[model samples]
Target: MFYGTVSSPDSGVYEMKIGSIIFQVASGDITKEEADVIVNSTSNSFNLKAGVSKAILECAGQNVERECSQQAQQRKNDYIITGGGFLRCKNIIHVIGGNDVKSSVSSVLQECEKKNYSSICLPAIGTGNAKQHPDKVAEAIIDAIEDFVQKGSAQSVKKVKVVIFLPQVLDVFYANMKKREG
Candidate 1:
């Protein structure tokens, strides 16, 4: 089994350390107030948005869409962007993790790995309006990340943080991680 250590960043949250990966567990869309890095969302056209990516762009002093496109090309993933001014971290990898099976999740993980990010944050994929069960979604995410690490695709990634928004969802992930360990 993979070995990991856990730390608390703040109340009601834990950061799991798997190798170099710091997986932060929190409750919500990670805000500028909460983190130095905030991931952006991609448009339906597969391009980065303006208002949506604004917080980071303005903070970074970059032209939102243009920088987003440049980052996407550098990462070879349509879902990633960088040079957003709002973040303390240099880049915000915007992954379009849609509702899908575990395999689809693995594919996204692979893409994330290709970006060579030392750390990345993730929301529960398909859990928002997509309505996926929190436990199920968490499991799929764990599986994908583990697979990517083992495959050497995510060698540069030392952390994968999951930002959640509800107590119940937090409970689900906490319980599951404990159960797996126990």
Candidate 2:
């Protein structure tokens, strides 16, 4: 499905090594990346209509929704893992990042660490239709991911990639990420 269009996060990786785990901040489609897991910010029902969720559904196939339908309600700060279906990655994390992107991001990382999964790619959690400001969203994602690394919860995760679709989100992230350089 993503066979067309040019440019990708893989093309220009803005990467920094944070506590042994490489954190990549770049602009591109998350579905195009090859990682242990790919995350999607969705509603309690795992709606796959617009933004990143739509792209994931399109790329991963209808099985994602089929699996999602079997799930129970997910709160704003909750999340769950599902099969990646036919997507390039092995798993997909759907988070209700509507009100608390930071909590969502943190939990996603924790889940990955608990599962012993190595790499993951996530979009700017609330940067889509959730209408979260790009700057704050960047801060939360960076902070949460950095916390995961700082607390040494990333023993199994070799890489943590944040793939943003919008230029605003990418720019905001790049601006703040420099201070940490990780």
Candidate 3:
């Protein structure tokens, strides 16, 4: 079961590597993504009204949202880790906005290591209400991955997938990855 589903025959995938970590970008639905964890970008307020947050919350069921609201009451943190509800993933890493996109991705990766998660799926965050450019977001994501790899602490995370539903954003991410490959 999914919401706001979109598909295209032109959907494609791209892959790159840094250190032992495999990075990939493809066209797909985040809700249907199966991994140790999936990153969801939202506001500090945990408002899951639009964009990926809404899509995730809707598919994950009401308990996930309820859990997020409960976590919101705990403290003001950079992110909220919650149960994946009905989604296939085990946990959902909700990265709160207002921070630099690079740091946000880095924070999520660190959290993944903390949780001992071996893989993660991320969407092209910050390009929605954050009003960030796709090129910049893609660059920041790659920068974060490279930085993480440079630290030599990428033990638990073996694979990182950037799943994008929008064809245009998918193209941007793939192009950015190709630039790095060449």
Candidate 4:
């Protein structure tokens, strides 16, 4: 899973606006991306052992993992909100996924709206160990964002940063986002 010590893109490779929301696609380390909140797609039980969740858990350290585990103990919701620990973001929105990524993406956007977070960072869900085709995953993510923006009440979220690692996936994200121009 090592992408060779890649750093964040010097500038977003793709940028566009959907209604009031600005979407930027970049290749980077998600853990280091600065945003008000970042989305972590995990299991229903909030497992942080693999993929994006694992990287996040690693950067976030023990305190963040401890809180997620405690939230897992209760197990009431499909997602949990926790403090960001050592991450650049102030909060982390851990959503239950690697399944239903569209809903998870939408759900995170909705949370940003509700909490008045001006910006958020998201990874390309299911594109890792799930073996989903980058094109498919790209469509799902952009579809969710399009739906969220068209919903008429997404007033709080002003920026969406999509941090992708794989070159193919990053290209796919840019291509998909490019097609959404209005």
Shift of residue 158 alpha carbon in model 3, Å: 0.6
Q: For each candidate, what is the lDDT? A: 0.57, 0.77, 0.82, 0.78
Q: How many backbone clashes does candidate 1 have?
A: 16
**Considering every candidate listed, which one attains the maximal lDDT?**
3
Worst 10 residues of 4 by lDDT: 1-10
RMSD of each: 4.8, 6.6, 6.6, 6.3
The order by descending TM-score is 3, 4, 2, 1
Provide the global lDDT of candidate 3 against the true structure. 0.82
lDDT of 4 at 165: 75
lDDT of 4 by residue, 1-182 (tens): 10112223456556776777777788878988899998887777776568788899898889988898898888588789999999999799987655777877888888887888899998888777666678888888777877876667678888888888776678777767556554
In model 3, what are the clashing residue pairs, if there are any? none
Candidate 2: residue 113 lDDT (0-100):
83
- Please give each candidate's TM-score: 0.65, 0.87, 0.90, 0.88
- What is the alpha-carbon lDDT for the whole of candidate 4? 0.78
lDDT of 1 at 83: 51
In candidate 2, what are the lDDT values of residues 1-182, reduced to their tens digit? Answer: 10111123456667666666777788888888899889888776676469888888888878778777766544332576789888788889888757688788888788888889998899888777787888888788767876877676778888888888877678777777676651
